[PDB]
Amino acid sequence: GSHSMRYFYTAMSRPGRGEPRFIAVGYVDDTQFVRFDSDAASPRMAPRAPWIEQEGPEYWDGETRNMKASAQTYRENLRIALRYYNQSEAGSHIIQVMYGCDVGPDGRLLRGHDQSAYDGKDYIALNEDLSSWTAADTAAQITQRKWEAARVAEQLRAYLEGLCVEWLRRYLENGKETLQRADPPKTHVTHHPISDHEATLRCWALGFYPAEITLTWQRDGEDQTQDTELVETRPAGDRTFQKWAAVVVPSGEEQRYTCHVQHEGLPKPLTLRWEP
Amino acid sequence: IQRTPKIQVYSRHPAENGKSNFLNCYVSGFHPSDIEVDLLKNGERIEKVEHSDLSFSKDWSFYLLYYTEFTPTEKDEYACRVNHVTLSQPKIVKWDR
Amino acid sequence: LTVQVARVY
Predict the structure, then answer these.
(1) Domain A1-181: CATH architecture, name and number where available
(2) Using CB atoms, which residue from B26, B32, B53 is nearest to A94?
(3) Mode of pairing for the β-strands spanning A121-126 and A109-118
(4) Which residue of A39, A131, A138, B25 is most buried, as measured by CB atoms within 10 A?
(5) Residue B12 and residue B17: Cα distance in Å, rounded?
(6) What does altering residue 52 to V do (chain A)?
């Protein structure tokens, strides 16, 4: 199917407790494959997936140098952002960055991303055209004017169309046993009376990959979106994910409810019910 | 400016007493990133608990998975204890199979 | 592979 590569940077200042922490993680789809932590005893870009380990010394050395440089750059950007928002040097602040590329089945660029936040709020984003910027406020507009002057968008576009897609393709090939394998959800419905005239039906999906899944309850064929309790999709720790959806139903009407499951690993959507 | 963590406590595989498993505490949707997470066995902190590398969702909120090897039983109680700047006191979520 | 583009805020 379609695939994505995404890097996530977090830079967190901590006045009185040294220089800002910088953590970078890299993902292909829902699979983390590299990490860098400036607080590690010996900071370096390190493997987090088996298929990335075959990359040679030049890869890891280059990526390590780059992550150290990026750490410095975003420490500086934290100071700059302090100035842009008229904030004191006493407080702790965070810059987050997510960037990367989406490609289709034929490996062609579907779209590129480079977006950042300051203290959890949108700061600046490369538009889909990979040529203009969306700044969330006047500070970010200052940054935008800087990046327009230096034609940063052109360089990012060069990265996203070239190296990003090429290396994503390389990774997809090297890890095709896992990255190009969908694991369908193992599904079942549980039933727990809460009272003499109400019962919870809980629709479970387990052991699926990738994380993207749709779990819905229908009553007499009508979607129960407003009445369905949906937990956040959560990692199992073995690359796979888990999710459930719960509905409270009148006792004796359980068979009027059906759970519908959509996932890439499934040839067709599933319908299941409580089976007493 | 700040977001309180969502907490889920669960196992990697369906719980079977006497069978080895992994106890998970997934914390998500929080901001800022500093957070304190303990796994508890009968109220006592489990040592050498591991966790994932800090990352975040598209809405910039952070998530972390804390996990440890465990063998569930009938009597043993397991929980996750989470502290965050949005929390006046540690929040404890008991493990429910 | 990570990006190498100068982006000072």
Answers:
(1) 2-Layer Sandwich (3.30)
(2) B32
(3) antiparallel
(4) B25
(5) 14
(6) In allele B*54:01
